[PDB]
blood group a-and b-cleaving endo-beta-galactosidase (Streptococcus pneumoniae), 351 residues
Amino acid sequence: HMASTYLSDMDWSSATHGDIDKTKTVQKDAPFTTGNKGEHTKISLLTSDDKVKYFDKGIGTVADSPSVISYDISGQGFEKFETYIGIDQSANSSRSDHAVVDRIEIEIDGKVVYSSSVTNPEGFRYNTQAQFISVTIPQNAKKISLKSFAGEHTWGDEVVFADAKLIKTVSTQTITPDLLNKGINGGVYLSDLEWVDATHGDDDKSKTVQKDKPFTPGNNGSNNKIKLLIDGKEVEFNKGLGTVASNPSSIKYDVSGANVTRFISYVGIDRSANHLNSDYADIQKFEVVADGKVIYSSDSKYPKGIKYDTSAFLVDVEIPKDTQTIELKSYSGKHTWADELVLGGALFMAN
Ligand SMILES: CC(=O)N[C@@H]1[C@@H](O)[C@H](O[C@@H]2O[C@H](CO)[C@H](O)[C@H](O[C@H]3O[C@H](CO)[C@H](O)[C@H](O)[C@H]3O)[C@H]2O[C@@H]2O[C@@H](C)[C@@H](O)[C@@H](O)[C@@H]2O)[C@@H](CO)O[C@H]1O
Ligand SMILES: [Ca+2]
Ligand code: NA
């Protein structure tokens, strides 16, 4: 059960670079120069056999004596640090005195735990192929430092720590939209299951509750994914359910032949749904019901209901065992016509 956190999705406690222009800063998820210029170029290194590889995540800097990027990792339980290292393909390397990096170092708590000295005794040039390194982290480590040594000049020393991440072994994962998009071990998506039956609050009964799509767009033949507001940002979902709330509407699952321990989903209104400004909620509440018994209700934490501009909230409820039947109940706001709900990434943990 491996958990990862990219360094570019964190905050450094300190960061230095070897560019004279101190208004420029260390670039997250981009090369140093192109990033500071506002260009959209991504991090690119050389894998085996002069093969160019592009990366979404990483850190981009200019080496100094040394350039140092430090992260505070006190009591976070990390075990491994892993990254590609090398000079970016975008580096200004027409001059031989450009893109010449002496050394790359990983330091943990004042101790150098990795040095590129062994693999690269002549350091890195513009054409040197990337090194993928895995650096062990001691039990109670506090501070990790990425260090790049420029040598005689900093020119073209566009050092990238491509795909840089910190790794640990956790018991249970922490639920995020990306985790539900990537998958979870033992998590079965409801949209990959058959319900006993389902009802909705739309008059057109030729329409049906939708799998991996919002209700109306799904019923019209659109293949667009579910999209929700998560902490102010619009976030797509690969899996989920699209339905219309009623008095309530319901979707029924038979779990009498299984050992389901958990129901997990984000719940909100799809970004493509019709809405109107109102003091009143679009959806009054959403309930999870285990054998006629309500085990979760959204009004326990959202008593006013949910509007279009409400951030999708996370439902993560324990399922009592020997549960035969699970019911998902969607309740109309009653004052508007907007009744369309989506369950983003909806899944059962079978354990
Ligand atoms: C007119 C004039 O002479 N202007 C000076 C300018 O030449 C000089 O710019 C730097 O020139 C050196 C060679 O002498 C290098 O080519 C620098 O570029 C390279 O190195 C940096 C990091 O050290 C970075 O990796 C660049 O991408 C890489 O191309 C030049 O510096 C770069 O350009 C200038 C214009 C600024 O934007 C810098 O912030 C940038 O790093 C500078 C520095 O001596 O002084 C000018 O007066
Ligand atoms: Ca150099
Ligand atoms: Na409504």
